[PDB]
Amino acid sequence: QLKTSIGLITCRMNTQNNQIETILVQKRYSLAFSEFIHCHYSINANQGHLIKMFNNMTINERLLVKTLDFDRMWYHIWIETPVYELYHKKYQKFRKNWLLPDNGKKLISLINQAKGSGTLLWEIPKGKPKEDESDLTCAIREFEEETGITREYYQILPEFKKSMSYFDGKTEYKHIYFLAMLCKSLEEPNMNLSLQYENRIAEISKISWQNMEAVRFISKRQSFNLEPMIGPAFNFIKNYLRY
Amino acid sequence: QLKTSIGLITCRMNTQNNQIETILVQKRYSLAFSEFIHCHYSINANQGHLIKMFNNMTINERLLVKTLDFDRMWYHIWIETPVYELYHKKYQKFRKNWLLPDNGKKLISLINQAKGSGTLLWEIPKGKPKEDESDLTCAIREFEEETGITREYYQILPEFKKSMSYFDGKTEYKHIYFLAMLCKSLEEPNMNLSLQYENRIAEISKISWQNMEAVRFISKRQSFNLEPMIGPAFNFIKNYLRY
């Protein structure tokens, strides 16, 4: 099939240096954890995944799994949003895998034997377009759903549009990116994260300005490499700022 | 008074580059969170702290506080180690601050109004010496309590010893550091973190080799600056490796 996400690259010049920075966001939890409490694994096939899943969670996440209070695990991703059917499907699939048969003991054992720890991803804010939206409207909406940064702080630069496509697993994920330049100054965007706006924090743990060296530094340390999108983003910024 | 911690700086040469790296560890939770469930704050004095404490927690931590299940907050730091008296002291101090008076509503409100998010520290493994120990014995013991890295992997370099002293708050914290060079190769130290060794994970979320640029990068982004200890550590390594 074709999974397609659309995001926005928002940049500024932090006047202290002659350096272009962009907004990246960090995820609160790992994919591995999310795959676990949504049961994206089988207990009859693919052992090697079951082992990788547990290893690629953070230590805190594993500690949550060691609890066996699936509700506590659910809260970590959902934070009390009401999905009962979703909940109870996953809960019963959870109950039949390690509570009925072995009473946790295989799960708990697998948790203990799990070695190392995962890494929470830095990403360009991106999302899935609503049915009646233009690409750019999705990008705008998703960008400030995720950062509180409203329209009056940036100007869309219309003639930029980059598109990565992935199939490392497999199907095809198309990632499309517009570009924005900041105008009203905004020195501390990580300050828009607050538990009262439960959708900025549903998935984000940090918002932050990142120059290029930060972009490269983070990319050496996570599977998702994001120089191919910030590289051209910043180049386009430079050529724009000249004129 | 004189608070004194003693740690060990363990280095290697990752042959791929001509680059010296050292072991740093990351904390699982923030000081702000730990100050909160141990009641290192007053509700009658120092409002400005109460606000900073909440802001300097991670989003997950705040979500734990938004639970009001103090036991769930306790588990985050203690992971079921038996301290009942400690627990019940802190629980009752917790109960009388926001459960009795306002039934959470001021605490929950303060949580919601909390803006931004904290950062979990990267540190050189360090600890507090037992009563009958030499400095170096504390450093050795604490180093592999915290990383699983036993004695046969490194050689102590005896003629290095660095000592920082802090009083930004205030009292005096003396931080003393020995130096070790790796010998048996150890390509992936983050693999020693596992919930079966509950004391390596009690406080650590990642172990990792860091070259100098990583050291500087992390230091621009956390209050604890650690170039003054790795700087001389690496210099001493270089001069050692020559001869």
Author numbering:
A (entry chain A), B (entry chain A): 6 to 248
What does the article say, verbatim?
As the only nucleoside diphosphate-linked moiety X (Nudix) decapping enzyme encoded in the ASFV genome, g5Rp works in both the degradation of cellular mRNA and the hydrolyzation of the diphosphoinositol polyphosphates. Each protomer is composed of a unique N-terminal helical domain and a C-terminal classic Nudix domain. As g5Rp is an mRNA-decapping enzyme, we identified key residues, including K8, K94, K95, K98, K175, R221, and K243 located on the substrate RNA binding interfaces of g5Rp which are important to RNA binding and decapping enzyme activity.
To investigate structural insights into the catalytic mechanism of g5Rp, we determined its dimeric structure by single-wavelength anomalous diffraction (SAD) phases using selenomethionine (SeMet)-labeled protein. The g5Rp dimer is composed of two protomers that each adopt a “boxing glove” shape with a distinct helical domain and Nudix domain. The helical domain (residues 36 to 124) forms a globin-fold-like feature composed of six α-helices (α1 to α6) that connects to the Nudix domain by two hinge linkers (linker I, residues 32 to 35; linker II, residues 119 to 139). The Nudix domain (residues 1 to 35 and 125 to 250) consists of a central curved β-sheet (β1, β2, β3, β4) surrounded by five α-helices (α7 to α11) and several loops, thereby forming a classic α-β-α sandwich structure. The other dimer interface was located at the linker II portion of the C terminus and one solvent contact surface of the Nudix domain.
